[PDB]
Coordinates of C-alpha atoms and ligand atoms in Angstrom, one line a residue:
Chain A
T29 CA -4.0 -9.3 33.0
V30 CA -7.5 -10.2 31.7
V31 CA -10.8 -8.7 32.8
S32 CA -14.3 -9.5 31.7
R33 CA -17.6 -7.6 31.3
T34 CA -21.1 -8.8 30.5
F35 CA -23.6 -6.6 28.8
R36 CA -27.4 -7.0 28.8
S37 CA -28.5 -7.3 25.2
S38 CA -31.8 -8.3 23.5
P39 CA -34.5 -7.7 24.6
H40 CA -33.2 -5.2 27.2
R41 CA -31.1 -3.4 24.5
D42 CA -31.4 -4.0 20.8
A43 CA -28.3 -5.3 19.0
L44 CA -27.1 -1.8 17.9
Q45 CA -27.7 -0.3 21.4
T46 CA -25.6 -3.2 22.8
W47 CA -22.8 -2.4 20.4
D48 CA -23.0 1.3 21.2
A49 CA -22.7 0.5 24.9
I50 CA -19.6 -1.7 24.1
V51 CA -18.0 1.1 22.1
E52 CA -18.5 3.5 24.9
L53 CA -16.9 1.0 27.4
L54 CA -13.9 0.6 25.1
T55 CA -13.3 4.2 24.0
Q56 CA -14.3 6.1 27.1
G57 CA -15.4 9.3 25.4
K58 CA -12.3 9.7 23.2
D59 CA -13.0 11.0 19.7
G60 CA -10.3 9.2 17.7
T61 CA -9.6 6.7 15.0
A62 CA -10.3 3.7 17.3
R63 CA -13.8 4.9 18.1
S64 CA -14.4 5.7 14.4
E65 CA -13.3 2.2 13.4
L66 CA -15.5 0.5 16.0
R67 CA -18.5 2.7 14.9
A68 CA -17.7 1.9 11.2
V69 CA -18.3 -1.9 11.8
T70 CA -21.6 -1.3 13.6
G71 CA -23.6 -3.2 10.9
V72 CA -21.4 -6.3 11.2
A73 CA -21.1 -6.2 15.0
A74 CA -24.8 -5.6 15.6
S75 CA -25.5 -8.5 13.2
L76 CA -23.4 -10.8 15.2
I77 CA -24.9 -9.7 18.5
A78 CA -28.4 -10.2 17.0
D79 CA -27.3 -13.8 16.3
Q80 CA -26.1 -14.1 20.0
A81 CA -22.5 -14.8 18.9
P82 CA -21.1 -13.2 22.1
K83 CA -23.3 -15.3 24.5
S84 CA -20.7 -18.0 25.0
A85 CA -17.6 -16.7 23.2
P86 CA -16.4 -13.2 24.1
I87 CA -15.7 -10.1 22.1
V88 CA -12.0 -9.7 22.9
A89 CA -10.2 -6.4 23.0
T90 CA -6.3 -6.4 23.1
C91 CA -4.1 -3.4 23.7
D92 CA -0.9 -2.2 25.3
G93 CA -2.4 -3.2 28.6
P94 CA -5.0 -5.7 29.9
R95 CA -7.2 -7.8 27.7
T96 CA -10.9 -7.3 27.9
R97 CA -13.4 -10.1 27.3
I98 CA -17.0 -8.9 26.7
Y99 CA -20.0 -11.3 26.9
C100 CA -23.6 -10.5 26.1
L101 CA -26.7 -11.7 27.9
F102 CA -29.9 -12.5 26.1
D103 CA -33.6 -13.3 26.8
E104 CA -34.4 -13.8 30.5
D105 CA -30.8 -13.3 31.5
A106 CA -30.8 -9.8 29.9
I107 CA -34.2 -8.9 31.4
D108 CA -33.0 -10.1 34.9
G109 CA -29.5 -8.6 34.6
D110 CA -28.2 -10.6 37.6
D111 CA -25.1 -11.8 35.7
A112 CA -24.5 -8.3 34.1
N113 CA -21.2 -6.5 34.7
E114 CA -21.0 -3.1 32.9
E115 CA -18.6 -1.4 35.2
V116 CA -16.2 1.2 33.7
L117 CA -12.8 -0.3 32.9
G118 CA -9.9 0.9 35.1
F119 CA -7.5 1.4 32.1
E120 CA -7.4 2.6 28.5
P121 CA -8.8 -0.5 26.8
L122 CA -7.6 0.2 23.3
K123 CA -4.2 1.8 24.2
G124 CA -1.5 1.6 21.6
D125 CA -1.4 -1.3 19.2
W126 CA -5.0 -2.4 19.7
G127 CA -7.1 -5.1 18.2
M128 CA -10.6 -6.6 18.6
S129 CA -11.7 -10.2 17.9
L130 CA -15.4 -10.7 17.3
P131 CA -17.0 -14.1 17.7
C132 CA -18.8 -15.4 14.6
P133 CA -20.6 -18.6 13.6
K134 CA -18.2 -20.4 11.2
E135 CA -20.8 -20.4 8.4
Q136 CA -20.9 -16.6 8.4
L137 CA -17.2 -16.0 8.6
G138 CA -16.8 -15.6 4.9
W139 CA -19.1 -12.5 4.6
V140 CA -18.2 -11.2 8.0
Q141 CA -14.5 -11.2 7.6
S142 CA -14.8 -9.5 4.2
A143 CA -17.2 -6.9 5.6
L144 CA -14.9 -6.1 8.4
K145 CA -11.9 -5.8 6.1
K146 CA -13.5 -2.9 4.4
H147 CA -13.3 -0.8 7.6
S148 CA -10.4 -2.1 9.7
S149 CA -7.4 -4.3 9.9
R150 CA -7.5 -4.3 13.7
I151 CA -11.1 -5.6 14.1
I152 CA -11.3 -9.2 13.0
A153 CA -13.7 -12.1 13.4
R154 CA -13.1 -15.7 14.6
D155 CA -15.0 -18.9 14.6
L156 CA -16.9 -18.8 17.9
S157 CA -16.0 -22.4 18.7
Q158 CA -12.4 -21.2 19.2
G159 CA -10.5 -18.6 21.2
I160 CA -8.1 -16.0 19.9
Chain B
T21 CA -43.4 -0.3 -15.2
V22 CA -41.9 -2.9 -12.8
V23 CA -39.0 -5.2 -13.7
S24 CA -37.6 -8.1 -11.6
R25 CA -34.2 -9.7 -11.2
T26 CA -33.2 -12.8 -9.2
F27 CA -29.7 -13.3 -8.0
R28 CA -27.9 -16.4 -6.9
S29 CA -26.8 -16.0 -3.3
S30 CA -25.4 -18.4 -0.8
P31 CA -23.7 -20.9 -1.3
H32 CA -23.0 -19.7 -4.9
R33 CA -22.1 -16.3 -3.5
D34 CA -21.6 -15.3 0.1
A35 CA -23.9 -12.6 1.5
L36 CA -21.4 -9.8 0.8
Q37 CA -20.6 -10.9 -2.7
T38 CA -24.4 -11.0 -3.3
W39 CA -24.8 -7.4 -2.2
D40 CA -21.9 -6.4 -4.4
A41 CA -23.5 -8.1 -7.4
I42 CA -26.8 -6.2 -6.6
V43 CA -24.9 -3.0 -6.3
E44 CA -23.3 -3.6 -9.7
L45 CA -26.7 -4.3 -11.2
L46 CA -28.3 -1.1 -9.8
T47 CA -25.4 1.3 -10.4
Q48 CA -24.0 -0.3 -13.6
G49 CA -20.5 0.7 -12.4
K50 CA -21.2 4.4 -12.3
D51 CA -20.2 6.6 -9.3
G52 CA -22.3 9.0 -7.3
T53 CA -24.5 9.1 -4.2
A54 CA -26.2 5.8 -5.2
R55 CA -23.1 3.7 -5.4
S56 CA -21.7 5.4 -2.4
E57 CA -24.8 5.0 -0.2
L58 CA -25.3 1.4 -1.3
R59 CA -21.8 0.5 -0.5
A60 CA -22.0 2.3 2.9
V61 CA -24.8 -0.1 4.1
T62 CA -22.9 -3.2 3.0
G63 CA -22.7 -4.7 6.6
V64 CA -26.4 -4.3 7.2
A65 CA -27.5 -5.4 3.7
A66 CA -25.2 -8.5 3.8
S67 CA -26.6 -9.4 7.3
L68 CA -30.1 -9.4 5.8
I69 CA -29.1 -11.5 2.8
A70 CA -27.4 -14.0 5.2
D71 CA -30.7 -14.2 7.0
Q72 CA -32.5 -14.9 3.6
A73 CA -34.6 -11.8 3.9
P74 CA -34.9 -11.3 0.1
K75 CA -35.9 -14.9 -0.6
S76 CA -39.7 -14.2 -0.6
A77 CA -39.9 -10.4 -0.2
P78 CA -37.9 -8.4 -2.7
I79 CA -35.3 -5.7 -2.4
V80 CA -37.2 -2.8 -4.1
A81 CA -35.5 0.1 -5.9
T82 CA -37.4 3.2 -7.0
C83 CA -36.1 5.9 -9.3
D84 CA -37.1 8.3 -12.1
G85 CA -38.0 5.4 -14.2
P86 CA -39.1 1.7 -13.7
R87 CA -39.2 0.1 -10.2
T88 CA -36.8 -2.8 -9.8
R89 CA -37.6 -5.8 -7.6
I90 CA -34.6 -8.0 -6.7
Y91 CA -35.0 -11.5 -5.2
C92 CA -32.3 -13.8 -4.0
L93 CA -31.9 -17.5 -4.4
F94 CA -30.4 -19.7 -1.8
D95 CA -29.2 -23.3 -1.3
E96 CA -30.3 -25.6 -4.0
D97 CA -31.8 -22.8 -6.1
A98 CA -28.6 -20.9 -5.9
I99 CA -26.4 -23.9 -6.8
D100 CA -28.3 -24.8 -10.0
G101 CA -29.3 -21.3 -10.8
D102 CA -32.5 -22.5 -12.6
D103 CA -34.6 -19.4 -11.6
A104 CA -31.8 -16.8 -11.8
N105 CA -32.1 -13.6 -13.8
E106 CA -29.1 -11.3 -13.5
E107 CA -29.3 -9.5 -16.8
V108 CA -28.2 -5.9 -17.2
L109 CA -31.1 -3.5 -16.9
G110 CA -32.0 -1.3 -19.9
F111 CA -32.5 1.8 -17.8
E112 CA -30.7 3.8 -15.1
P113 CA -32.2 1.9 -12.1
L114 CA -31.2 4.6 -9.5
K115 CA -31.7 7.7 -11.6
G116 CA -32.9 10.9 -9.8
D117 CA -34.5 10.8 -6.4
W118 CA -34.0 7.1 -5.8
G119 CA -34.9 4.9 -2.9
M120 CA -34.5 1.4 -1.8
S121 CA -36.6 -0.8 0.5
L122 CA -34.8 -3.8 2.1
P123 CA -36.8 -6.7 3.5
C124 CA -36.0 -7.4 7.2
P125 CA -37.1 -10.0 9.8
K126 CA -39.4 -8.3 12.2
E127 CA -37.2 -9.3 15.2
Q128 CA -34.2 -7.3 13.7
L129 CA -36.1 -4.3 12.4
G130 CA -35.2 -2.2 15.4
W131 CA -31.4 -2.5 15.1
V132 CA -31.5 -2.5 11.3
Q133 CA -33.5 0.6 10.9
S134 CA -31.2 2.5 13.3
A135 CA -28.1 1.1 11.5
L136 CA -29.3 2.2 8.1
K137 CA -30.3 5.7 9.3
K138 CA -26.7 6.4 10.1
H139 CA -25.8 6.2 6.4
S140 CA -28.8 7.1 4.3
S141 CA -32.3 8.4 4.3
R142 CA -32.9 6.7 0.9
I143 CA -32.3 3.1 2.0
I144 CA -34.9 1.9 4.5
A145 CA -35.9 -1.5 5.9
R146 CA -39.4 -3.0 6.1
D147 CA -40.9 -5.9 7.9
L148 CA -40.6 -8.8 5.5
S149 CA -43.8 -10.4 6.7
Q150 CA -45.9 -7.5 5.4
Ligands
CA13 CA1 -28.4 -13.3 11.4

């Protein structure tokens, strides 16, 4: 099972507000190590959102359960919101042996993958021209 | 008293390696709030370096002592290193009630300032155009 969501980002939300909304979607109010790790990579994740990395390549969460693909909308699409889908997820999106794959322009992968590795082994980045 | 340093960044160093080299310069390997707070903002600082924010507007450190301005070189300048200056500083660059001002593109100031605020009240971002 795979489900998708689409969040309104800049200029409706700034890049950090966008990540915070994604963290809430994926952690659902649970104060645990998963939420702590997602919050720990905020600088990197917001940087990638500000570069519109998730416009055409999703943030992908994997778990003991359905996969979640998260896209972001920018510019007029974010202002309009017609393509947005921010519904609550009908499952625990980071259950069990979870992971997250962040899209990243290939030229930034060097610094991004190192920056992520400081905080997590479950949150990784990929070249946004490829899937997981 | 103001002193300046200029570091070779991408492609000689990636943006994170560049921040780490700056942290080494300003902390001189010593532990404390300074090294800890500088390392805590690595994701934001590296993002700014990757966007060449310190090319024309310096990273500025203040302390009980001289102010340090740090510029970054990119692309051809970083490859040849002609204008580089990475010499150890002759003073404790983050002694006492230290602070750091990071240059930031105006379009990203909103998220960057919120991201830094999570980690530190001593490290702030400014609009690099000003
Ligand atoms: Ca960028």
